[PDB]
Paper text:
The activity of HygA-macrolide pairs against bacteria harboring erm resistance genes prompted us to determine X-ray crystal structures of HygA-macrolide combinations bound to the Erm-methylated 70S ribosome containing N6-dimethylated residue m26A2058. Using our recent methodology, Erm-modified 70S ribosomes were isolated from Tth cells expressing the erm-like gene from Bifidobacterium thermophilum. Co-crystallization of these Erm-methylated ribosomes with PY and the same HygA-macrolide pairs as before (HygA-ERY, HygA-AZI, and HygA-TEL) provided crystals diffracting to 2.35–2.65 Å resolution. Remarkably, the observed electron-density maps revealed strong peaks corresponding to HygA and the macrolides (ERY, AZI, or TEL) bound to the A2058-N6-dimethylated ribosomes (respectively), allowing us to build molecular models unambiguously. In the WT ribosome, this water molecule is coordinated by the nucleobase of A2058 and the phosphate of G2505 and serves as a binding partner for the dimethylamino moiety of the functionally critical desosamine sugar of a macrolide. In the Erm-methylated ribosome, this water molecule is displaced due to direct sterical hindrance with the methyl groups appended to the A2058 residue, rationalizing the significantly reduced affinity of macrolides to the Erm-modified ribosome. However, the overall binding positions of ERY, AZI, or TEL on the A2058-methylated 70S ribosome in the presence of HygA appear to be nearly identical to their binding sites in the WT ribosome. Interestingly, the dimethylamino moiety of the desosamine sugars of ERY, AZI, or TEL rotates by ~180° around the C-N bond and finds a new H-bonding partner—the carbonyl oxygen of the fucofuranose ring of ribosome-bound HygA. The distance between the H-bonding N and C atoms is 3.2–3.5 Å, pointing to the rather weak character of this H-bond.
Many of currently used antibiotics inhibit protein synthesis in pathogenic microorganisms by targeting their 70S ribosomes, which are complex macromolecular machines responsible for this process. The catalytic peptidyl transferase center (PTC) located at the heart of the large ribosomal subunit (50S in bacteria) polymerizes amino acids into polypeptides in the order specified by the nucleotide sequences of the translated mRNAs. Newly-made proteins emerge from the ribosome through the nascent peptide exit tunnel (NPET) that spans the body of the large ribosomal subunit beginning at the PTC and ending on the opposite side of the large ribosomal subunit facing the cytoplasm. Here, we discover that well-known ribosomal antibiotics, hygromycin A (HygA) and macrolides, which target peptidyl transferase center and peptide exit tunnel, respectively, can act cooperatively against susceptible and drug-resistant bacteria.
Residue numbers in the entry:
A (entry chain 17): 1 to 48
B (entry chain 1D): 2 to 276
Write the structure that this text describes.
Amino acid sequence: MKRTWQPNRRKRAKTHGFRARMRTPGGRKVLKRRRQKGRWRLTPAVRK
Amino acid sequence: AVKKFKPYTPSRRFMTVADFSEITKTEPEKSLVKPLKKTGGRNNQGRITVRFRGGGHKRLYRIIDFKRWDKVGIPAKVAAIEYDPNRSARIALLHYVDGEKRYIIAPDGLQVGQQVVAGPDAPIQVGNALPLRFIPVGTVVHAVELEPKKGAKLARAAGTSAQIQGREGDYVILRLPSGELRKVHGECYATVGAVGNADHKNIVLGKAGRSRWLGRRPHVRGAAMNPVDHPHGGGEGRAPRGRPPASPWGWQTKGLKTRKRRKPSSRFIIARRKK
RNA sequence: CCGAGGGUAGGGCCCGUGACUGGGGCGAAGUCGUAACAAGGUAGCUGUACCGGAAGGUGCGGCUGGAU
RNA sequence: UGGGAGAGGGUGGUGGAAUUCCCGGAGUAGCGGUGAAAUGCGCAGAUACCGGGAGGAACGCCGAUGGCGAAGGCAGCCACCUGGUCCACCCGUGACGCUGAGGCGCGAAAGCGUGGGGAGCAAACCGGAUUAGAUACCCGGGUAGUCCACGCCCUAAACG
RNA sequence: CGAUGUCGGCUCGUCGCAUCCUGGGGCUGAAGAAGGUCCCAAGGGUUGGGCUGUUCGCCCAUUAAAGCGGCACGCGAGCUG
RNA sequence: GAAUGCCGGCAUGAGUAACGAUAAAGAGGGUGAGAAUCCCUCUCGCCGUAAGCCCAAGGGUUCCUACGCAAUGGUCGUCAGCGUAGGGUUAGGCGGGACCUAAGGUGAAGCCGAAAGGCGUAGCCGAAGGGCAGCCGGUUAAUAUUCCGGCCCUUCCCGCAGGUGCGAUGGGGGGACGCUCUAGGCUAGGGGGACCGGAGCCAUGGACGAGCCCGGCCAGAAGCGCAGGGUGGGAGGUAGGCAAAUCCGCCUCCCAACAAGCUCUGCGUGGUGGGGAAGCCCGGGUGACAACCCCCCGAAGCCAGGGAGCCAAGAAAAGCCUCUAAGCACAACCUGCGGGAACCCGUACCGCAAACCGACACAGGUGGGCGGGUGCAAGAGCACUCAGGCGCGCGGGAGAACCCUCGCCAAGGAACUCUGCAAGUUGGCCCCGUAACUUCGGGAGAAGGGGUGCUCCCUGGGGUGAUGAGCCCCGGGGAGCCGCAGUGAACAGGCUCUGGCGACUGUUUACCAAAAACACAGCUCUCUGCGAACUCGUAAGAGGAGGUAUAGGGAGCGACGCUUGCCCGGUGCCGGAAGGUCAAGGGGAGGGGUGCAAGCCCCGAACCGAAGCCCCGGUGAACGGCGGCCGUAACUAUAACGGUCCUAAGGUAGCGAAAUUCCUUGUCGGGUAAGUUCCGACCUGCACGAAAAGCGUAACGACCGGAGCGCUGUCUCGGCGAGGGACCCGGUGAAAUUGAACUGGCCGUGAAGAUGCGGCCUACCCGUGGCAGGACGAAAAGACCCCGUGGAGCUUUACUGCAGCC
RNA sequence: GAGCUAGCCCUGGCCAGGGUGAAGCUGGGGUGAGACCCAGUGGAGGCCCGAACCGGUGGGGGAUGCAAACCCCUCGGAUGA
Ligand SMILES: CC[C@H]1OC(=O)[C@H](C)[C@@H](O[C@H]2C[C@@](C)(OC)[C@@H](O)[C@H](C)O2)[C@H](C)[C@@H](O[C@@H]2O[C@H](C)C[C@H](N(C)C)[C@H]2O)[C@](C)(O)C[C@@H](C)CN(C)[C@H](C)[C@@H](O)[C@]1(C)O
Ligand SMILES: [Mg+2]
Ligand SMILES: [Mg+2]
Ligand SMILES: [Mg+2]
Ligand SMILES: [Mg+2]
Ligand SMILES: [Mg+2]
Ligand SMILES: [Mg+2]
Ligand SMILES: [Mg+2]
Ligand SMILES: [Mg+2]
Ligand SMILES: [Mg+2]
Ligand SMILES: [Mg+2]
Ligand SMILES: [Mg+2]
Ligand SMILES: [Mg+2]
Ligand SMILES: [Mg+2]
Ligand SMILES: [Mg+2]
Ligand SMILES: [Mg+2]
Ligand SMILES: [Mg+2]
Ligand SMILES: [Mg+2]
Ligand SMILES: [Mg+2]
Ligand SMILES: [Mg+2]
Ligand SMILES: [Mg+2]
Ligand SMILES: [Mg+2]
Ligand SMILES: [Mg+2]
Ligand SMILES: [Mg+2]
Ligand SMILES: [Mg+2]
Ligand SMILES: [Mg+2]
Ligand SMILES: [Mg+2]
Ligand SMILES: [Mg+2]
Ligand SMILES: [Mg+2]
Ligand SMILES: [Mg+2]
Ligand SMILES: [Mg+2]
Ligand SMILES: [Mg+2]
Ligand SMILES: [Mg+2]
Ligand SMILES: [Mg+2]
Ligand SMILES: [Mg+2]
Ligand SMILES: [Mg+2]
Ligand SMILES: [Mg+2]
Ligand SMILES: [Mg+2]
Ligand SMILES: [Mg+2]
Ligand SMILES: [Mg+2]
Ligand SMILES: [Mg+2]
Ligand SMILES: [Mg+2]
Ligand SMILES: [Mg+2]
Ligand SMILES: [Mg+2]
Ligand SMILES: [Mg+2]
Ligand SMILES: [Mg+2]
Ligand SMILES: [Mg+2]
Ligand SMILES: [Mg+2]
Ligand SMILES: [Mg+2]
Ligand SMILES: [Mg+2]
Ligand SMILES: [Mg+2]
Ligand SMILES: [Mg+2]
Ligand SMILES: [Mg+2]
Ligand SMILES: [Mg+2]
Ligand SMILES: [Mg+2]
Ligand SMILES: [Mg+2]
Ligand SMILES: [Mg+2]
Ligand SMILES: [Mg+2]
Ligand SMILES: [Mg+2]
Ligand SMILES: [Mg+2]
Ligand SMILES: [Mg+2]
Ligand SMILES: [Mg+2]
Ligand SMILES: [Mg+2]
Ligand SMILES: [Mg+2]
Ligand SMILES: [Mg+2]
Ligand SMILES: [Mg+2]
Ligand SMILES: [Mg+2]
Ligand SMILES: [Mg+2]
Ligand SMILES: [Mg+2]
Ligand SMILES: [Mg+2]
Ligand SMILES: [Mg+2]
Ligand SMILES: [Mg+2]
Ligand SMILES: [Mg+2]
Ligand SMILES: [Mg+2]
Ligand SMILES: [Mg+2]
Ligand SMILES: [Mg+2]
Ligand SMILES: [Mg+2]
Ligand SMILES: [Mg+2]
Ligand SMILES: [Mg+2]
Ligand SMILES: [Mg+2]
Ligand SMILES: [Mg+2]
Ligand SMILES: [Mg+2]
Ligand SMILES: [Mg+2]
Ligand SMILES: [Mg+2]
Ligand SMILES: [Mg+2]
Ligand SMILES: [Mg+2]
Ligand SMILES: [Mg+2]
Ligand SMILES: [Mg+2]
Ligand SMILES: [Mg+2]
Ligand SMILES: [Mg+2]
Ligand SMILES: [Mg+2]
Ligand SMILES: [Mg+2]
Ligand SMILES: [Mg+2]
Ligand SMILES: [Mg+2]
Ligand SMILES: [Mg+2]
Ligand SMILES: [Mg+2]
Ligand SMILES: [Mg+2]
Ligand SMILES: [Mg+2]
Ligand SMILES: [Mg+2]
Ligand SMILES: [Mg+2]
Ligand SMILES: [Mg+2]
Ligand SMILES: [Mg+2]
Ligand SMILES: [Mg+2]
Ligand SMILES: [Mg+2]
Ligand SMILES: [Mg+2]
Ligand SMILES: [Mg+2]
Ligand SMILES: [Mg+2]
Ligand SMILES: [Mg+2]
Ligand SMILES: [Mg+2]
Ligand SMILES: [Mg+2]
Ligand SMILES: [Mg+2]
Ligand SMILES: [Mg+2]
Ligand SMILES: [Mg+2]
Ligand SMILES: [Mg+2]
Ligand SMILES: [Mg+2]
Ligand SMILES: [Mg+2]
Ligand SMILES: [Mg+2]
Ligand SMILES: [Mg+2]
Ligand SMILES: [Mg+2]
Ligand SMILES: [Mg+2]
Ligand SMILES: [Mg+2]
Ligand SMILES: [Mg+2]
Ligand SMILES: [Mg+2]
Ligand SMILES: [Mg+2]
Ligand SMILES: [Mg+2]
Ligand SMILES: [Mg+2]
Ligand SMILES: [Mg+2]
Ligand SMILES: [Mg+2]
Ligand SMILES: [Mg+2]
Ligand SMILES: [Mg+2]
Ligand SMILES: [Mg+2]
Ligand SMILES: [Mg+2]
Ligand SMILES: [Mg+2]
Ligand SMILES: [Mg+2]
Ligand SMILES: [Mg+2]
Ligand SMILES: [Mg+2]
Ligand SMILES: [Mg+2]
Ligand SMILES: [Mg+2]
Ligand SMILES: [Mg+2]
Ligand SMILES: [Mg+2]
Ligand SMILES: [Mg+2]
Ligand SMILES: [Mg+2]
Ligand SMILES: [Mg+2]
Ligand SMILES: [Mg+2]
Ligand SMILES: [Mg+2]
Ligand SMILES: [Mg+2]
Ligand SMILES: [Mg+2]
Ligand SMILES: [Mg+2]
Ligand SMILES: [Mg+2]
Ligand SMILES: [Mg+2]
Ligand SMILES: [Mg+2]
Ligand SMILES: [Mg+2]
Ligand SMILES: [Mg+2]
Ligand SMILES: [Mg+2]
Ligand SMILES: [Mg+2]
Ligand SMILES: [Mg+2]
Ligand SMILES: [Mg+2]
Ligand SMILES: [Mg+2]
Ligand SMILES: [Mg+2]
Ligand SMILES: [Mg+2]
Ligand SMILES: [Mg+2]
Ligand SMILES: [Mg+2]
Ligand SMILES: [Mg+2]
Ligand SMILES: [Mg+2]
Ligand SMILES: [Mg+2]
Ligand SMILES: [Mg+2]
Ligand SMILES: [Mg+2]
Ligand SMILES: [Mg+2]
Ligand SMILES: [Mg+2]
Ligand SMILES: [Mg+2]
Ligand SMILES: [Mg+2]
Ligand SMILES: [Mg+2]
Ligand SMILES: [Mg+2]
Ligand SMILES: [Mg+2]
Ligand SMILES: [Mg+2]
Ligand SMILES: [Mg+2]
Ligand SMILES: [Mg+2]
Ligand SMILES: [Mg+2]
Ligand SMILES: [Mg+2]
Ligand SMILES: [Mg+2]
Ligand SMILES: [Mg+2]
Ligand SMILES: [Mg+2]
Ligand SMILES: [Mg+2]
Ligand SMILES: [Mg+2]
Ligand SMILES: [Mg+2]
Ligand SMILES: [Mg+2]
Ligand SMILES: [Mg+2]
Ligand SMILES: [Mg+2]
Ligand SMILES: [Mg+2]
Ligand SMILES: [Mg+2]
Ligand SMILES: [Mg+2]
Ligand SMILES: [Mg+2]
Ligand SMILES: [Mg+2]
Ligand SMILES: [Mg+2]
Ligand SMILES: [Mg+2]
Ligand SMILES: [Mg+2]
Ligand SMILES: [Mg+2]
Ligand SMILES: [Mg+2]
Ligand SMILES: [Mg+2]
Ligand SMILES: [Mg+2]
Ligand SMILES: [Mg+2]
Ligand SMILES: [Mg+2]
Ligand SMILES: [Mg+2]
Ligand SMILES: [Mg+2]
Ligand SMILES: [Mg+2]
Ligand SMILES: [Mg+2]
Ligand SMILES: [Mg+2]
Ligand SMILES: [Mg+2]
Ligand SMILES: [Mg+2]
Ligand SMILES: [Mg+2]
Ligand SMILES: [Mg+2]
Ligand SMILES: [Mg+2]
Ligand SMILES: [Mg+2]
Ligand SMILES: [Mg+2]
Ligand SMILES: [Mg+2]
Ligand SMILES: [Mg+2]
Ligand SMILES: [Mg+2]
Ligand SMILES: [Mg+2]
Ligand SMILES: [Mg+2]
Ligand SMILES: [Mg+2]
Ligand SMILES: [Mg+2]
Ligand SMILES: [Mg+2]
Ligand SMILES: [Mg+2]
Ligand SMILES: [Mg+2]
Ligand SMILES: [Mg+2]
Ligand SMILES: [Mg+2]
Ligand SMILES: [Mg+2]
Ligand SMILES: [Mg+2]
Ligand SMILES: [Mg+2]
Ligand SMILES: [Mg+2]
Ligand SMILES: [Mg+2]
Ligand SMILES: [Mg+2]
Ligand SMILES: [Mg+2]
Ligand SMILES: [Mg+2]
Ligand SMILES: [Mg+2]
Ligand SMILES: [Mg+2]
Ligand SMILES: [Mg+2]
Ligand SMILES: [Mg+2]
Ligand SMILES: [Mg+2]
Ligand SMILES: [Mg+2]
Ligand SMILES: [Mg+2]
Ligand SMILES: [Mg+2]
Ligand SMILES: [Mg+2]
Ligand SMILES: [Mg+2]
Ligand SMILES: [Mg+2]
Ligand SMILES: [Mg+2]
Ligand SMILES: [Mg+2]
Ligand SMILES: [Mg+2]
Ligand SMILES: [Mg+2]
Ligand SMILES: [Mg+2]
């Protein structure tokens, strides 16, 4: 039956992407925290 | 006249349609339509603020001339009577000798071919608009402004009208469609006659699908819900109201008056609606 | 082939009968009241409508086959 | 052909008196109602009086023992549309007539349907009386209805 | 109570005997035939239907008889629900 | 040494279950160390509205070739979507961008918010919508509308020639639209051909044939032809389209008008370029100088922005055309032609799946297009089958119990059971025929029956031709033939009578409930006069609504028919300028502290002082409520009648042992041999009753009752048969659980149900197939129940606050 | 966090074939004119039968599954809310 992950690159980039994070106090805190933890990726990679 | 159907389906037994007899043109004037942005009842936050709206037939908005003092003295010929999905009244396309075209809401008795005009000097005949103080006492009128130059606000639905009942100073006393008796400024414009399509109120929708075509989603009773939803929610099996009948928000809904008490317009309202 | 009739199925008419129920007639030796006949104690009657234990009442309209 | 009388019918208009309600004034100790009363209304200012407004229904005098209509039935006034009928002339047609089972139409009031309208009145209903009781008669309230449009119903002491 | 699954039905039995039948008896208000009552006896047997979830019970038609109890009101790592 | 402790390692269950659709395999040849599993050939089976083909998501090298087999692959492996390496994706025209707007998002101006931020007309962004120029064939191991070949086309720049008042982000036109039905003419696609081309074939009894088998086209500028779409022409007036206007709008006049004209698209043809089968031979060669024609069927596609009808009344913006303004008129633009210029990104492969979403090479999920033929009335249904693709990544045997899926059954025929649960029966089409009741539609496929194949003969109407033959579609009549049986296989209602509930079609607890629940047209109450009420938001702003009382919000009721009684004392709501109570504030009699004092400071009575509450009324489709006792009639029984207590008033009409009735299987009647259910009655209604509506109601229902007919393995009552498992051998190889175990019965005992204690009985050691009585068997720190001064949801005339409103 | 699910907004797409035969229209009948009746034409509908598609009614299987909701048979809607 239809499951919960139905990938869609436009949706991924527009929802979790770098620019979406930057537009928002909470989103910039996500970038700040992931940079502080030393994450290799700050944002999901989507092909485009 | 309203048109009935033979009961060749369960819903056609009661369904009735407008007869559309007054309609002489089946397409809107292209220069006078704009897209009507459907809302679903949602405001600019995305939130439902009026329940049970959405999913009605697509519509174009016809631009209506609710001013008419816009063009004092310039007669126009009644070119067509058209259907307007955004209102119960029919609309009338006017061709001004100007060459300008405009819609007004179609009064009862309006005839395609005849001429109408607006202004203090206009004849007192169906379709003409005058400031209120130049229309004889006793005349029934529609498309009435509430304050000067702000637009026709009163008596706009199918078959409605207001009657002039007297004068007093700068104001004239109207009996509104609701039966209320109200002062309206004499410089307010009105159009002599009653709004047409008076058979509108005898339409029997016939089935649930018809409300859906109109954008009306199913309304659900408080009694059919749960306490988290509605004052009337819950109870085991069916329940009576068990408290003064209330809205989804708790305010009482069987008599509780709700017009604001210190409202400035109260100085101009003579008698609250009857009935 | 037709064919008495038998069989299957579905209809129509009539008769008898049925838990229970509607009123009717007669009986009269009872209970309630007294609607009509006198102006019958609210003139009567009447079609209809709503009502009342009951006869009845009231409304609307009609008739005189109503006393004074 | 030429005349007449008439609440004959249908539609649109329109006038005045009265009742009720609302507003302003003025005014106060009751008003109302009955055989007599009480309910009711009234100092939260009623009734009675003056002024203004709204609204529905019915048309006083003329009016009669009158007129018209096939019957039901029709009454302020104006206009329009329309029916029946009487008289005079004795001009036209030439028995073209009488009746009429079925049919079709009309058909008071009440009642019904869908809208409207709602002053007065008033079934149902509530109360006060009356009374032995009083699901009545009388009194104070009161909803349908009474009024308009359209569609039904098709009854009568629809009687001379 | 860090779980001992419950009514009734079905299936599968096994046991007790305070015995429903069949076998053996005494007493009888036992003529006979048929019964009544008690004693011995558990070897085997103890029907099919209508109603109701029912156990039970009532009823229809039979029968030699249409027994009553126990087994976690036997039996859901056997079924039903 | 224990914490159902934590991390790791390793056991047990066990060579056990399983190895993932029952579409299916067999043999020969080859390769290799090794072959059921890789390659090749023949045979067999399966899909074929797909299990074939193409595109979009998503995936991201999985593509091709070489060399490999440790691991991955449910076995094997020489093979692979696996390991290593090399190669492979080519565009002005395909898609997206250098174009347009949609919702929405963002946002100059502006508005709002403690901050962060929220909004916001323009503008901008935003596409699978609008707009825009490429078809066919060939080529590679792997790309191709991209390379190549042929024939076409678009834009930009510059130039030349002709023409024109040129010029825009401004004005206008256009772009520009629904649903259902549908005409004419085409094309896609298909069927047939005794005609055209072709390697061959004559088998096994016949056939050298009008034989069999195979193919008989694709693209194509201009021109032309057929069919369609779009579009009136001229003049005069002009105050409107926020400037201007010759344009557009309006008025008038003349001509033209279902003609034409002009314009555009489709289809045909068309110089020219290609393609080209079976079979044979080792993807290619040959067939071949291939032929490339006639007839028929025919779209849902095209002409297209076609036509009609209908109500629910059906985007925008740019490209485009036209108008003029600044300007500029040696320019600029328009047309023709020529030369030049023409960027960025994607392009492999999978793509109903072993490459996407499901932890897996997972029987599940995934949007668009093509989807052949014959037959069955039609069809995308069903059976077979083409092209194409597969046999599902463990096998070999055996022929038990049992399980699954399937076939049949004597006699009976619901006796099964909670229930005909399940399974039978019925089954398409044509004809005949069809009841109560009804809202006149229906009920209705009612029910019930008859026909159904093939052969010959005669014939009817339509389509295409031509008006005929031929082809094709729908038929009809007569006479015959065969079988058990003719929709001969596959797909395809069992029916009827009668109650309950809900009017109806719909909706719902994703994953235990599809219902009588929700919704629904419709009915009523109520709020709301517009900067509406109401809703979201602190606000601004929004929705309501670009609506205006025939409208919008809230509530109940729930098609329709006939109806909807009485109680307003309590609560609610509505009305009430009186009166009572009433806070801040006003007032300031009087009193107090202090100072030598003027003074400063404090307390404070009358009186004035809102909403609210009290009080007076109204109000039920507002919350709600709707009695008891005693007596009385020619026998009894009962009580129309009377009396009396209480109440705000004492349940009306209708219905009633009911989706409600405790006693209860009430009683009576019906049906049955027998009826706790069912239907019809009665009424002492424990505890119906009138919009939490009352009583009915045709039609409807995968709802829930009761009965009958048909028919059956449901049953008496079981039997046989089939395949997939189970069993045996080879390969691979889990799991929960597990204190350790050398783990029998009885009767006792024991914390009260003992393999483990006592007595006695019984018992050689170890397995395999089976069955489930026990190990108070496994699983889940009982959901019930209680306890905890544990939690959470919900209610209210609990408390106390807050928002909101006054 | 609305790539699942619920509702709405914008823009696209899909629904084989068969059946029933409303209004209207035309003709005829009828009447003073009508209503109306009959036939033909017509093609309406939360109409009917049934695929795709959307569901999930009853039963069976599955139950350390093919699957943390699947499979077979049956069944509901299928121009509309
Ligand atoms: C169908 C598959 C399921 O298996 C079931 O459904 C069983 C039939 C179920 O049984 C079903 C059906 C039924 C009728 O069982 C008696 C019902 O009462 C219970 C609640 O669930 C069991 C017996 C229940 O276990 C019972 O839990 C009861 C509360 C008490 C009872 N007691 C006897 C101890 C005990 O057996 C249980 C609690 O569900 C099991 C629990 C340990 C684990 N579950 C959560 C699992 C995940 C199940 O969902 C399941 C394995 O997927
Ligand atoms: Mg999706
Ligand atoms: Mg992904
Ligand atoms: Mg995407
Ligand atoms: Mg995308
Ligand atoms: Mg997206
Ligand atoms: Mg982003
Ligand atoms: Mg990481
Ligand atoms: Mg790094
Ligand atoms: Mg991130
Ligand atoms: Mg109708
Ligand atoms: Mg109709
Ligand atoms: Mg009609
Ligand atoms: Mg109906
Ligand atoms: Mg109409
Ligand atoms: Mg109209
Ligand atoms: Mg009209
Ligand atoms: Mg349109
Ligand atoms: Mg708009
Ligand atoms: Mg809007
Ligand atoms: Mg917004
Ligand atoms: Mg937002
Ligand atoms: Mg709302
Ligand atoms: Mg809404
Ligand atoms: Mg309109
Ligand atoms: Mg209307
Ligand atoms: Mg209505
Ligand atoms: Mg609408
Ligand atoms: Mg509504
Ligand atoms: Mg509702
Ligand atoms: Mg609920
Ligand atoms: Mg909530
Ligand atoms: Mg709450
Ligand atoms: Mg609440
Ligand atoms: Mg409640
Ligand atoms: Mg309750
Ligand atoms: Mg409830
Ligand atoms: Mg409930
Ligand atoms: Mg209850
Ligand atoms: Mg409820
Ligand atoms: Mg309910
Ligand atoms: Mg309650
Ligand atoms: Mg209630
Ligand atoms: Mg209550
Ligand atoms: Mg105002
Ligand atoms: Mg015989
Ligand atoms: Mg008397
Ligand atoms: Mg009398
Ligand atoms: Mg009575
Ligand atoms: Mg009485
Ligand atoms: Mg009375
Ligand atoms: Mg009379
Ligand atoms: Mg007399
Ligand atoms: Mg006073
Ligand atoms: Mg008089
Ligand atoms: Mg003469
Ligand atoms: Mg009458
Ligand atoms: Mg009446
Ligand atoms: Mg009395
Ligand atoms: Mg009445
Ligand atoms: Mg009435
Ligand atoms: Mg008389
Ligand atoms: Mg316990
Ligand atoms: Mg445990
Ligand atoms: Mg346990
Ligand atoms: Mg004897
Ligand atoms: Mg003895
Ligand atoms: Mg024995
Ligand atoms: Mg024994
Ligand atoms: Mg019992
Ligand atoms: Mg008994
Ligand atoms: Mg015997
Ligand atoms: Mg015996
Ligand atoms: Mg026992
Ligand atoms: Mg016990
Ligand atoms: Mg017990
Ligand atoms: Mg048991
Ligand atoms: Mg069990
Ligand atoms: Mg059990
Ligand atoms: Mg056990
Ligand atoms: Mg059972
Ligand atoms: Mg220890
Ligand atoms: Mg553990
Ligand atoms: Mg453990
Ligand atoms: Mg541990
Ligand atoms: Mg651990
Ligand atoms: Mg070990
Ligand atoms: Mg084992
Ligand atoms: Mg095992
Ligand atoms: Mg497995
Ligand atoms: Mg199978
Ligand atoms: Mg091998
Ligand atoms: Mg090998
Ligand atoms: Mg091979
Ligand atoms: Mg991946
Ligand atoms: Mg490739
Ligand atoms: Mg390997
Ligand atoms: Mg290997
Ligand atoms: Mg492996
Ligand atoms: Mg695997
Ligand atoms: Mg090798
Ligand atoms: Mg592989
Ligand atoms: Mg290479
Ligand atoms: Mg190219
Ligand atoms: Mg560029
Ligand atoms: Mg695009
Ligand atoms: Mg081309
Ligand atoms: Mg390539
Ligand atoms: Mg438009
Ligand atoms: Mg569009
Ligand atoms: Mg549609
Ligand atoms: Mg064909
Ligand atoms: Mg042509
Ligand atoms: Mg001009
Ligand atoms: Mg070739
Ligand atoms: Mg050659
Ligand atoms: Mg089609
Ligand atoms: Mg409409
Ligand atoms: Mg726009
Ligand atoms: Mg200039
Ligand atoms: Mg030019
Ligand atoms: Mg560039
Ligand atoms: Mg690139
Ligand atoms: Mg490519
Ligand atoms: Mg699939
Ligand atoms: Mg992958
Ligand atoms: Mg999974
Ligand atoms: Mg997941
Ligand atoms: Mg596999
Ligand atoms: Mg798969
Ligand atoms: Mg094809
Ligand atoms: Mg067939
Ligand atoms: Mg067929
Ligand atoms: Mg099928
Ligand atoms: Mg084939
Ligand atoms: Mg296989
Ligand atoms: Mg074996
Ligand atoms: Mg048999
Ligand atoms: Mg039978
Ligand atoms: Mg039988
Ligand atoms: Mg049953
Ligand atoms: Mg069949
Ligand atoms: Mg019948
Ligand atoms: Mg009928
Ligand atoms: Mg019907
Ligand atoms: Mg039949
Ligand atoms: Mg029937
Ligand atoms: Mg044959
Ligand atoms: Mg056969
Ligand atoms: Mg088949
Ligand atoms: Mg069928
Ligand atoms: Mg029936
Ligand atoms: Mg019942
Ligand atoms: Mg009912
Ligand atoms: Mg229903
Ligand atoms: Mg329901
Ligand atoms: Mg009903
Ligand atoms: Mg309903
Ligand atoms: Mg429904
Ligand atoms: Mg439906
Ligand atoms: Mg569920
Ligand atoms: Mg659930
Ligand atoms: Mg769940
Ligand atoms: Mg779950
Ligand atoms: Mg759930
Ligand atoms: Mg289920
Ligand atoms: Mg459910
Ligand atoms: Mg259902
Ligand atoms: Mg409901
Ligand atoms: Mg109703
Ligand atoms: Mg709020
Ligand atoms: Mg705003
Ligand atoms: Mg707004
Ligand atoms: Mg707006
Ligand atoms: Mg509105
Ligand atoms: Mg409902
Ligand atoms: Mg009826
Ligand atoms: Mg009463
Ligand atoms: Mg009350
Ligand atoms: Mg009250
Ligand atoms: Mg209360
Ligand atoms: Mg002192
Ligand atoms: Mg009422
Ligand atoms: Mg109370
Ligand atoms: Mg109530
Ligand atoms: Mg007595
Ligand atoms: Mg009662
Ligand atoms: Mg009863
Ligand atoms: Mg009942
Ligand atoms: Mg009850
Ligand atoms: Mg009880
Ligand atoms: Mg009972
Ligand atoms: Mg009981
Ligand atoms: Mg009984
Ligand atoms: Mg039963
Ligand atoms: Mg039952
Ligand atoms: Mg009784
Ligand atoms: Mg309720
Ligand atoms: Mg109820
Ligand atoms: Mg019914
Ligand atoms: Mg159902
Ligand atoms: Mg069997
Ligand atoms: Mg067999
Ligand atoms: Mg077998
Ligand atoms: Mg087998
Ligand atoms: Mg076998
Ligand atoms: Mg062996
Ligand atoms: Mg040991
Ligand atoms: Mg024990
Ligand atoms: Mg023990
Ligand atoms: Mg023991
Ligand atoms: Mg032992
Ligand atoms: Mg020991
Ligand atoms: Mg010891
Ligand atoms: Mg021992
Ligand atoms: Mg022993
Ligand atoms: Mg051993
Ligand atoms: Mg065991
Ligand atoms: Mg067991
Ligand atoms: Mg043990
Ligand atoms: Mg055990
Ligand atoms: Mg156990
Ligand atoms: Mg715990
Ligand atoms: Mg515990
Ligand atoms: Mg517990
Ligand atoms: Mg637990
Ligand atoms: Mg406890
Ligand atoms: Mg405590
Ligand atoms: Mg404690
Ligand atoms: Mg506590
Ligand atoms: Mg709490
Ligand atoms: Mg409020
Ligand atoms: Mg978020
Ligand atoms: Mg979503
Ligand atoms: Mg769209
Ligand atoms: Mg469809
Ligand atoms: Mg027809
Ligand atoms: Mg028409
Ligand atoms: Mg349908
Ligand atoms: Mg259907
Ligand atoms: Mg299912
Ligand atoms: Mg079944
Ligand atoms: Mg089965
Ligand atoms: Mg499960
Ligand atoms: Mg399945
Ligand atoms: Mg299936
Ligand atoms: Mg089916
Ligand atoms: Mg269907
Ligand atoms: Mg269909
Ligand atoms: Mg439908």
